Every structure is written in structure tokens, then in C-alpha cells.
Design a protein around this ligand. Structure first.
Ligand SMILES: OC[C@H]1O[C@H](O[C@H]2[C@H](O)[C@@H](O)[C@@H](O[C@H]3[C@H](O)[C@@H](O)[C@@H](O[C@H]4[C@H](O)[C@@H](O)[C@@H](O)O[C@@H]4CO)O[C@@H]3CO)O[C@@H]2CO)[C@H](O)[C@@H](O)[C@@H]1O
Ligand SMILES: OC[C@H]1O[C@H](O[C@H]2[C@H](O)[C@@H](O)[C@@H](O)O[C@@H]2CO)[C@H](O)[C@@H](O)[C@@H]1O
Ligand SMILES: OC[C@H]1O[C@H](O[C@H]2[C@H](O)[C@@H](O)[C@@H](O)O[C@@H]2CO)[C@H](O)[C@@H](O)[C@@H]1O
Ligand SMILES: OC[C@H]1O[C@H](O[C@H]2[C@H](O)[C@@H](O)[C@@H](O)O[C@@H]2CO)[C@H](O)[C@@H](O)[C@@H]1O
Ligand SMILES: [Ca+2]
Ligand SMILES: [Ca+2]
Length: 686
């Protein structure tokens, strides 16, 4: 299939995701609605169930509401079984309508549907070229009080009906009993409870094995992607081992939630996106878009900075999922604001790099503050809104114009209020002009583009007061006036002659797994694929076509490789970097080093004999290790993903800047378990 087919579960760059709060979308089957005090059919009480389900979604997929918009993927609430208790939070009754209070990860939430309904959802979707993404929240179960076991369901965890354990009298230690996080540090927010949510302990083999088993059930049910909830709140090493479980079984596009505040830029966030095997929800993008188009607390130079910065910070910026709002923020549209603000932000998001996600109801101009006012029932299924039409004109471009799906971004004209940028990939170009000033038009002179000489009609057809562009020689555009609140899109597409890799996925796996390389100019006859210097051709290349190649990862030593392809004629493509070849299946092991005293600003790291440990390269050591919660300084600890069953030699180091100090003595050694987890406790050797 081509890179753009619904069958492509490794790439979402050419798709537009529509985020649905199942309960608040459409009740297609009233028979499964909750009753009593846990239900409100009028959906006036937004913390109770309103009845939306999978049938409803199927109904909107079939009646053309979603397809009419140009939406090609839907991201739904966590489908697993949630607790049934109504929880009174100081007078207010609260239900698990949101789906984040899991009780059993191997069963469905009956309010949404049966496994049968779920299989039907996947089939209907797939039938209409819509990919299905599920929310998955393995950080915790539900709200529990260890001393008030009668509270809620005491955060009880079941394994397909079988009670695994509860928060109270947790002798197995499936959970964390470290108190609640104050979000003070990253380590603090990981090993302590999120509010009152029973924090699962991924270092317990039972929990480890159970979650990796549950995800496979869902993978086996045909999902096309996974949105991981609260990634900033689970150990990174564990998550990497979790992503290795998915990729080494049935790879699917995974992206996690790592909340970033306004003007917040986290290096931990960058490292996570670049090394965990999964990408992230682009909070940097979202916060900046709101400041610029919504709250006017920054201008075009700020948007530009974010664009060029992110592109440098994220190794695969095209895999970051963009949005302008979600269920954890006020809705972008404020009741009294000019709608043109939402429209422009939509046009910008849809044509920008990454994977755009649209929160259900946006196209209907829904307003609302924080939870739960931002989760009201969709008031209508009208296709007559300007927002609906903007999405409808622009969504398809991600499929037909690879410049938009994979292209680089470049500012071509800019001022406080105006931003003109160009996306380019191969022989494809797209230029977008946005004028946020709702009162002042702008005189655009000196605009230079990569567009071939000719005239260009605004792809939006003047919907947002865009205009025609006239490009003379040198791609220099003639002067024109950009209307107040003006937005226009111009483009040029043509066949690409040389092999151009636009995307690879999964980004991390062990040898033998098949990866998908998407792009243009591959030709129709099998060429060669290179992993570093190793050439692969013939049978291991399972499929080859102009826009897509499927190939098995050769049995090469674990490590980081550049990927390049050369067509049948021997013409080489661009280089795609940062592909990680695992040493084998992975397991999460906790490393602990005692009495490793440091000086302030000096941290302890770990390195070892395998690529998962950096191969003795301090520049690639794992850390810095933690020393607050689970163990306290001068004892350090860290959860790391290592190849299962391998005997590994390791050592710790103290690093300050790029200045490193090695542990004395001989390498410590240990053999990783074949499954489940383990804890290695050693003393720092001077
Ligand atoms: O009582 C249970 C509640 O749980 C549910 O909240 C969810 C969110 O909907 C998820 O999308 C996600 O979001 C968390 C996020 O993981 C977490 O970081 C936190 O964000 C902090 C952030 O760390 C901090 O840096 C600072 O910026 O403040 C942020 C808060 O704005 O909060 C997000 C939202 O809670 O995970 C949580 C838990 O899975 C549910 O939505 C609630 O209705 C429910 O009451
Ligand atoms: O002509 C090439 C030149 O175009 C753009 O410069 C704009 C500038 O952004 C506007 O603010 C205003 O000053 O008009 C200029 C056009 O002459 C690009 O920003 C710039 O990089 C580029 O060299
Ligand atoms: O909590 C992380 C913290 O650990 C190290 O700080 C040590 C410091 O080295 C010791 O001399 C002593 O004062 O205790 C601290 C632990 O609380 C790192 O030096 C520091 O950068 C790091 O943030
Ligand atoms: O460079 C590979 C090499 O790294 C480690 O050796 C350290 C050694 O442990 C230190 O005490 C110090 O001498 O620096 C060496 C790095 O040059 C590993 O211990 C070793 O097995 C490995 O080959
Ligand atoms: Ca229902
Ligand atoms: Ca946690």
C-alpha cells in the first residue's frame, strides 16, 4: 500500500486525528447507559455519564460527519473496564465517564460497549479509511485511600475478573505507598501518587507482565495507535521496555502525554521523545499557539522561535502530535471571542509539521473552561460551520501534498502579526500566510518562495479572506495585500524523481522486526536498504513501492543506525537518523548503587557492555540516577530497559558537565531476567 493508506499503522503524519470523549460524543445504544445517580441523559451534570458509546461513533462514521470533515483517525477514551463507584468529592458526585479510573485492563467499559462493539468500531472505521487510536493509562488504577479501604474501589486491580490486589494491605506491593506528588521534581511526580490515584508499581513483575499482556490484547484487537497517558509520571526505562514489547510484537504509532506549561521547555521532555521509542503530544506547540492566536501574550516572532527550536530539539519533529486544546485545558474558543481566531489556529495546525489532533466539538465552536466544562456534549453535527469547512479543505492536503506531511518548515516573511511559511518535501511545496491582526491588513512585498512561476489560487478558496498569489521568476511573489485575519494556502505538487525518505517507524526494535519506510521516489523495483553500512536486499525487503518500503531489520549489533535507501538504479536517498536496533527483547531492571557521594551539580550515571547501556560511552550513559524517593542519597537508583537474559557488565560514573569519574574496581556483572523485573543492588567501588 502507499504511505497514505489506512493500513499504515506506523505513520500518522499524513492523517488528521479527531479526539473523542466517547461519553460526550453520541449515544448510539441507550441499552448500555449507566442508570441511577451515575447517569444524566440531558448531560447537564458533566461528571456523570451522558451515554455516548462506540455505536454512536460508528453511526457518525457511517453518516459522513467525520469523513465529510476529512478526518482520518479517531482517538477515543481508554476502552478498558473502569470502576463502578460514584465518588463524592466534597458534595459532588463523580463517575469514571472519562475512562481514566481503570479496574481491569483486559475488559471493556460496558458503558462504551462490548468487545464485539469494539471489533465493530474498528471494522467500520477501517472500512471508511479511519485509523483507531486508544488512550492507555498504565500509571495507576483509581482513587484509593489505604486507610479508608471502603473508599471507592480501593484502587482495586483485576486481571480479567480475577482480583490481583487493592491499595489497602498491599502485601504484594503492586502499588506505591510514598504519599502524593507535589510535582516538585520529575522523580517526585513519578514515584508518588497522582492526586489520589493508586500509583502502580512497574518494578513489580506481576504488574510489569500484566500490563504488557493487556496491551497485546488490544493490539490483537486491531488498534492502529496508542496514546499513553501521563508519561511524565512513570519510569522512563520501564516505558522504553513497554514500547519494546509493542514494537517487537505488533508495532503501532505510540505518542505520550507529557504536560508542558506556558513557556515551559523541558530537556527531559526532549530526551524522552528522542529515546523512549515514542513521540509526544506537542505541548510546546499548543501553548505557543494559544499565546499567539488566542491570548495574544506573544507574537509571530515567538511562533517562529518555537517552530525552529522544536525542529532542532526533537529528533523526529514530524511525529509530535499537535493540538490547540484538549480535555485538560479551557476550550480555545471563548464565547465572546472572534471565531476567526479559532479558524486561523486550525489552518495553522493543519498545515504545520507533526500530527494534528482536533478535540471533538472544535469545529462547532464549543466554549468551556476547565474540567469538566470543556467536556460538554457535542451540540450538533452540522457541516455548515466555517471551521468544519476549513478542516475539510485542509485535511486532505496532508495526504496529497507530502510537503505538508513530511516537509521542512521555513519562515519566508514575518512581522508581529503576520507569518508566512513554506513547507517543502521533494518536488512539493506549500506556502501558508497568516495575519493574526483582526483589524489591520498587511502589505506584503519581498516575499520569495520555492513556487514555480505562475499564479496560485488560495486552496481555502478565499474562505478566510485569502487571495491569489503571483509568482514571477526566482519564485519572487509580486506585492499583495494580506487581509485582516487573512489566511491563504498555495501549493505545488509534482512527481519526485530521486529516493526521498520522509518517515520511518517504528523507530526502535530488535532484529527481524519489519519497519516501514515512507517517502517518494523509491521507484517500483526493489532497491537496497542500508542500516549503517549493512546492505539489505532481496527477500528481507518484504515490499517496495514508490512511496513505501517494508523491510526486516538485519541481525546487526544493537545500537543506533542511519538508514538510507538506494533505488534499483543505485541512486541513494537522504539519510534518516536515530534508528535504534535493540539487542533483543527487553526487561525493566532497577539498578541501585550505594554510597556514591557526589558534589553539588555532580550526578551519578550508569554504563555497560550493551547498547541499551551505552556501550561504555560516557556520552551515552544512563542518568542522572535518582536519589530522593525510592532510595535516598548517597544511594542512587534508576529503572533501565535492558536486553532479556543477557549477562551484562556495568559500572557507574560521576559526571559533571562532560567531566567524568569512573567507579574503581572491576565491572559489576549480572544476568538480566528472561521476563518480569529485577533489582541490582551494588556498592560504589572507589
Ligand atoms: O482524580 C482523577 C483525575 O484523573 C484524570 O486526569 C488525567 C488527565 O486527563 C490526563 O490527560 C493526564 O493528565 C495529567 C498529567 O498527566 C499531569 O502531568 C497533570 O499535569 C500537571 C503538570 O504535571 C504540571 O507540570 C503542571 O503544569 O500542572 C499540570 C496540571 O495542569 O495533570 C494532567 C491532568 O490531570 O493524566 C491525568 C491522570 O491520568 C481526569 O481527567 C480527571 O477528571 C480526574 O479527576
Ligand atoms: O526578500 C527576502 C527576505 O524576505 C523576508 O523579509 C521580509 C520581512 O520578513 C518583512 O518583515 C519585511 O521586512 O519585508 C521583508 C521583505 O523584503 C524574509 O523574512 C527574509 O528572511 C528574506 O531575506
Ligand atoms: O537530588 C539530586 C541532586 O543530587 C546531587 O546532590 C547531592 C549533592 O551532590 C550532595 O553533596 C548532597 O548535598 O546531597 C545532594 C542530594 O540531595 C547532585 O549534586 C545534584 O545536582 C542533584 O540535583
Ligand atoms: O572504554 C571501554 C572500557 O570502559 C571501562 O573502563 C574504564 C575503567 O573501568 C576505569 O577504571 C578507567 O580506567 O577508565 C576506563 C575507560 O577507559 C570498562 O570498565 C571496560 O570494561 C571497557 O572495556
Ligand atoms: Ca449508550
Ligand atoms: Ca507513577
Amino acid at each position: 500500500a502507499p504511505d497514505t493508506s489506512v493500513s499504515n499503522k506506523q505513520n500518522f503524519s499524513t492523517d488528521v486525528i479527531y479526539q473523542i470523549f466517547t461519553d460526550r460524543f453520541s449515544d448510539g445504544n441507550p441499552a448500555n447507559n449507566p442508570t441511577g445517580a451515575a447517569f444524566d441523559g440531558t448531560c447537564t451534570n458533566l461528571r456523570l455519564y451522558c451515554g455516548g458509546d462506540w455505536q454512536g461513533i460508528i453511526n457518525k462514521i457511517n453518516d459522513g460527519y467525520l469523513t465529510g470533515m476529512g478526518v482520518t483517525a479517531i482517538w477515543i477514551s481508554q476502552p478498558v473496564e473502569n470502576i463502578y463507584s460514584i465518588i463524592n468529592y466534597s458534595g459532588v458526585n463523580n463517575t469514571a465517564y472519562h475512562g481514566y479510573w481503570a479496574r481491569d485492563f483486559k475488559k471493556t467499559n460496558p458503558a462504551y460497549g462490548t468487545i464485539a462493539d469494539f471489533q465493530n468500531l474498528i471494522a467500520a472505521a477501517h472500512a471508511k479509511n479511519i485509523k483507531v487510536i486508544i488512550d492507555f493509562a498504565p500509571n495507576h488504577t483509581s482513587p484509593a485511600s489505604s486507610d479508608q479501604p471502603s473508599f471507592a474501589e480501593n484502587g482495586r486491580l483485576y486481571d480479567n475478573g480475577t482480583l490481583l490486589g487493592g491499595y489497602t494491605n498491599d502485601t504484594q506491593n503492586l502499588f506505591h505507598h510514598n504519599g502524593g506528588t507535589d510535582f516538585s521534581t520529575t522523580e517526585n511526580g513519578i514515584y508518588k501518587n497522582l492526586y489520589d490515584l493508586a500509583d502502580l508499581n512497574h518494578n513489580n513483575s506481576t504488574v510489569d507482565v500484566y500490563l504488557k499482556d493487556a496491551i497485546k490484547m488490544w493490539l490483537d484487537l486491531g488498534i492502529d495507535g496508542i496514546r499513553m497517558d501521563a508519561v511524565k509520571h512513570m519510569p522512563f526505562g520501564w516505558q522504553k521496555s513497554f514500547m519494546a514489547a509493542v514494537n517487537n510484537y505488533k508495532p503501532v504509532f505510540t505518542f505520550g502525554e507529557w504536560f508542558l506549561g506556558v513557556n515551559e521547555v523541558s530537556p527531559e521532555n526532549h530526551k524522552f521523545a528522542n529515546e523512549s521509542g515514542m513521540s509526544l503530544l506537542d505541548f510546546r506547540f499548543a501553548q505557543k499557539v494559544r499565546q499567539v492566536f488566542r491570548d495574544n501574550t506573544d507574537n509571530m516572532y515567538g511562533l517562529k522561535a518555537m517552530l525552529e527550536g522544536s525542529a532542532a530539539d526533537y529528533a523526529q519533529v514530524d511525529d509530535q502530535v499537535t493540538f490547540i486544546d484538549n480535555h485538560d485545558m479551557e476550550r480555545f474558543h471563548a464565547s465572546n471571542a472572534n471565531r476567526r481566531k479559532l479558524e486561523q489556529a486550525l489552518a495553522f495546525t493543519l498545515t504545520s509539521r507533526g500530527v494534528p489532533a482536533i478535540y471533538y466539538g472544535t469545529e462547532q465552536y464549543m466554549s468551556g473552561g476547565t474540567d469538566p466544562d470543556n467536556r460538554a456534549r457535542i451540540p450538533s453535527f452540522s457541516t455548515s460551520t466555517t471551521a468544519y469547512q476549513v478542516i475539510q479543505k485542509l485535511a486532505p492536503l496532508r495526504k496529497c501534498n507530502p510537503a505538508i506531511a513530511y516537509g521542512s518548515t521555513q519562515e519566508r516573511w514575518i512581522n508581529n502579526d503576520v507569518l508566512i511559511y513554506e513547507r517543502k518535501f521533494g518536488s512539493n511545496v506549500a506556502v501558508v500566510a497568516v495575519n493574526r491582526n483582526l483589524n489591520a491588513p498587511a502589505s506584503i512585498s519581498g516575499l520569495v518562495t520555492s513556487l514555480p512561476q505562475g499564479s496560485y489560487n488560495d486552496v481555502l478558496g478565499g474562505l478566510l479572506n485569502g487571495n491569489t498569489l503571483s509568482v514571477g521568476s526566482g519564485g519572487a511573489a509580486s506585492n499583495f495585500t494580506l487581509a485582516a485575519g487573512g489566511t491563504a494556502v498555495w501549493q505545488y505538487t509534482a512527481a519526485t524523481a530521486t529516493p526521498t525518505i520522509g518517515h520511518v517507524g517504528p523507530m526502535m526494535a530488535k532484529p527481524g522486526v519489519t519497519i516501514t519506510i515512507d517517502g517518494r521516489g523509491f521507484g517500483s523495483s526493489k532497491g537496497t536498504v542500508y542500516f549503517g553500512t549493512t546492505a539489505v536486499s532481496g527477500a528481507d525487503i518484504t515490499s517496495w513501492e514508490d512511496t513505501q518500503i517494508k523491510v526486516k531489520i538485519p541481525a546487526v549489533a544493537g545500537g543506533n543506525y542511519n538508514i538510507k535507501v538506494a533505488n534499483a538504479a543505485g541512486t541513494a536517498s537522504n539519510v534518516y537518523d536515530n534508528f535504534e536496533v535493540l539487542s533483543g527483547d527487553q526487561v525493566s531492571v532497577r539498578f541501585v548503587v550505594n554510597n556514591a557521594t557526589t558534589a553539588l551539580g555532580q550526578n551519578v550515571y550508569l554504563t555497560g557492555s550493551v547498547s541499551e547501556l551505552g556501550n561504555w560511552d560516557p556520552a551515552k550513559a544512563i542518568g542522572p540516577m535518582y536519589n530522593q524517593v525510592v532510595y535516598q542519597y548517597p544511594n542512587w537508583y534508576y529503572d533501565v530497559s535492558v536486553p532479556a537474559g543477557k549477562t551484562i557488565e556495568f559500572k557507574f560514573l560521576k559526571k559533571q558537565g562532560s567531566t567524568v569519574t569512573w567507579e574503581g574496581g572491576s565491572n559489576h556483572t549480572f544476568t538480566a531476567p528472561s521476563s518480569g523485573t529485577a533489582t541490582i543492588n551494588v556498592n560504589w567501588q572507589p
